Design an enzyme around this catalytic site. Structure first.
Site, PDB file in Angstrom:
ATOM      1  N   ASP A   1       1.234  -1.177  -0.118  1.00 18.18           N
ATOM      2  CA  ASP A   1      -0.171  -0.600  -0.334  1.00 18.18           C
ATOM      3  C   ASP A   1       1.163   1.651  -0.203  1.00 18.18           C
ATOM      4  O   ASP A   1       1.114   1.700   1.531  1.00 18.18           O
ATOM      5  CB  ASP A   1      -1.139   0.063   1.154  1.00 18.18           C
ATOM      6  CG  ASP A   1      -2.178   0.917   1.137  1.00 18.18           C
ATOM      7  OD1 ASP A   1      -2.051   1.746  -0.075  1.00 18.18           O
ATOM      8  OD2 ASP A   1      -2.706   1.120   2.377  1.00 18.18           O
ATOM      9  N   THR A   2       0.957   1.952  -0.885  1.00 16.27           N
ATOM     10  CA  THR A   2       1.874   3.477  -1.059  1.00 16.27           C
ATOM     11  C   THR A   2       0.957   3.870  -1.024  1.00 16.27           C
ATOM     12  O   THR A   2       1.254   5.059  -0.607  1.00 16.27           O
ATOM     13  CB  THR A   2       2.225   3.496  -2.898  1.00 16.27           C
ATOM     14  OG1 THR A   2       0.916   3.378  -3.165  1.00 16.27           O
ATOM     15  CG2 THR A   2       3.390   2.105  -3.535  1.00 16.27           C
ATOM     16  N   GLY A   3      -0.337   3.885  -0.609  1.00 15.77           N
ATOM     17  CA  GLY A   3      -1.069   5.076   0.684  1.00 15.77           C
ATOM     18  C   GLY A   3      -0.444   5.104   1.501  1.00 15.77           C
ATOM     19  O   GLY A   3      -1.337   5.942   2.576  1.00 15.77           O
TER      20      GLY A   3
HETATM   21  C1  OR1 Z   1     -10.168   4.935  -1.848  1.00 13.69           C
HETATM   22  C2  OR1 Z   1     -10.843   3.965  -1.901  1.00 13.69           C
HETATM   23  C3  OR1 Z   1     -11.809   3.395  -2.859  1.00 13.69           C
HETATM   24  C4  OR1 Z   1     -12.430   2.212  -2.693  1.00 13.69           C
HETATM   25  C5  OR1 Z   1     -11.915   1.141  -2.259  1.00 13.69           C
HETATM   26  C6  OR1 Z   1     -10.776   0.976  -0.878  1.00 13.69           C
HETATM   27  C7  OR1 Z   1     -10.171  -0.452   0.161  1.00 13.69           C
HETATM   28  C8  OR1 Z   1     -10.462   2.428  -0.806  1.00 13.69           C
HETATM   29  O1  OR1 Z   1      -8.791   2.367   0.193  1.00 13.69           O
HETATM   30  C9  OR1 Z   1      -9.574   3.314   1.328  1.00 13.69           C
HETATM   31  C10 OR1 Z   1      -8.253   3.231   2.516  1.00 13.69           C
HETATM   32  O2  OR1 Z   1      -8.202   3.817   3.261  1.00 13.69           O
HETATM   33  N1  OR1 Z   1      -7.084   2.482   2.197  1.00 13.69           N
HETATM   34  C11 OR1 Z   1      -6.136   2.159   2.138  1.00 13.69           C
HETATM   35  C12 OR1 Z   1      -6.009   0.904   3.140  1.00 13.69           C
HETATM   36  C13 OR1 Z   1      -6.392   0.414   3.068  1.00 13.69           C
HETATM   37  C14 OR1 Z   1      -7.600  -0.721   2.567  1.00 13.69           C
HETATM   38  C15 OR1 Z   1      -9.026  -1.737   2.608  1.00 13.69           C
HETATM   39  C16 OR1 Z   1      -9.401  -1.657   4.392  1.00 13.69           C
HETATM   40  C17 OR1 Z   1      -8.708  -0.647   4.915  1.00 13.69           C
HETATM   41  C18 OR1 Z   1      -7.239   1.103   4.585  1.00 13.69           C
HETATM   42  C19 OR1 Z   1      -4.781   3.378   2.463  1.00 13.69           C
HETATM   43  O3  OR1 Z   1      -4.702   3.221   0.682  1.00 13.69           O
HETATM   44  C20 OR1 Z   1      -5.031   5.116   1.500  1.00 13.69           C
HETATM   45  C21 OR1 Z   1      -4.891   5.323   3.052  1.00 13.69           C
HETATM   46  C22 OR1 Z   1      -5.301   7.196   2.167  1.00 13.69           C
HETATM   47  C23 OR1 Z   1      -5.079   7.687   3.886  1.00 13.69           C
HETATM   48  C24 OR1 Z   1      -6.099   7.827   4.677  1.00 13.69           C
HETATM   49  C25 OR1 Z   1      -6.170   9.571   6.175  1.00 13.69           C
HETATM   50  C26 OR1 Z   1      -4.652   9.830   5.987  1.00 13.69           C
HETATM   51  C27 OR1 Z   1      -3.810   9.212   5.156  1.00 13.69           C
HETATM   52  C28 OR1 Z   1      -4.144   8.817   3.250  1.00 13.69           C
HETATM   53  N2  OR1 Z   1      -4.154   5.201   3.445  1.00 13.69           N
HETATM   54  C29 OR1 Z   1      -3.875   4.791   5.407  1.00 13.69           C
HETATM   55  O4  OR1 Z   1      -4.717   4.909   6.429  1.00 13.69           O
HETATM   56  O5  OR1 Z   1      -2.612   4.971   5.589  1.00 13.69           O
HETATM   57  C30 OR1 Z   1      -2.567   4.319   7.241  1.00 13.69           C
HETATM   58  C31 OR1 Z   1      -1.902   3.394   7.326  1.00 13.69           C
HETATM   59  O6  OR1 Z   1      -0.266   4.240   7.815  1.00 13.69           O
HETATM   60  C32 OR1 Z   1      -1.054   5.592   8.011  1.00 13.69           C
HETATM   61  O7  OR1 Z   1      -0.018   6.830   6.848  1.00 13.69           O
HETATM   62  C33 OR1 Z   1      -0.608   7.605   5.920  1.00 13.69           C
HETATM   63  C34 OR1 Z   1      -2.290   6.907   6.853  1.00 13.69           C
HETATM   64  C35 OR1 Z   1      -1.875   5.425   7.818  1.00 13.69           C
END
Ligand code: OR1
Lengths: 99, 99
Positions: free
Chosen positions: B25-27
């Site tokens: 997960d690059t995000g």
């Molecule tokens: C958008 C979308 C559409 C349809 C289906 C799905 C699954 C989707 O994705 C939703 C989604 O939250 N995905 C995430 C991965 C995932 C996938 C399935 C279920 C749970 C989480 C991730 O990849 C994106 C998220 C974006 C973000 C949110 C708040 C603040 C900064 C960035 N990053 C994230 O929470 O990171 C965490 C962990 O590390 C920390 O760093 C930064 C934040 C902390």
């Protein structure tokens, strides 16, 4: 280009004629953008992540430029803390993960 | 290898002697794992995501193997719906985005 992951992968996108910062996110199935005005009919949807779900509006066949590459596909609009380009558009611009 | 994004980038990881499915997960800035039995000291911490915040357990310098490449860094365990491998470890296995 080739994007390293030492910093957040933030890129410039163009949508509806406006420029914005978005995160290229392999863990997102779909693209979700901070609240904005988009043309067309739209459907309600919920997307879930860490901490729960948010209600978003699903616009279809929306044009969006991502670092110069054009894409046309589903764009979700809602209360995301960050603009995310998800796998639905990453595949369109030909993006792969390589290690 | 080269990983396309037509499907979720699920890979097998080895952590604490156990094998598991995780999302690359690059995000995500950090790595967050499903609730699990891991030995060692840990500190409480709060991390935020798309739907809000969750309390997690922060383990430091935890060893983790992802498709044969070794990484050691912070690993959070908490009520995430999915095991996510974040940039903290993706950089160690030498991962990049290319379009
Ligand atoms: C958008 C979308 C559409 C349809 C289906 C799905 C699954 C989707 O994705 C939703 C989604 O939250 N995905 C995430 C991965 C995932 C996938 C399935 C279920 C749970 C989480 C991730 O990849 C994106 C998220 C974006 C973000 C949110 C708040 C603040 C900064 C960035 N990053 C994230 O929470 O990171 C965490 C962990 O590390 C920390 O760093 C930064 C934040 C902390």
């Amino acid at each position: 280009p080739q994007i390293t992951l030492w910093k957040r992968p933030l890129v410039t996108i163009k949508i509806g004629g406006q420029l914005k910062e978005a995160l290229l996110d392999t863990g997102a199935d779909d693209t979700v953008l901070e609240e904005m005005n988009l043309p067309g009919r739209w459907k309600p949807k919920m997307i879930g992540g860490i901490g729960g779900f948010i209600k978003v509006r699903q616009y279809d066949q929306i044009l969006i430029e991502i670092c110069g590459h054009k894409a046309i596909g589903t764009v979700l609009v809602g209360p995301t803390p960050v603009n995310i380009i998800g796998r639905n558009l990453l595949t369109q611009i030909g993006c792969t993960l390589n290690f």
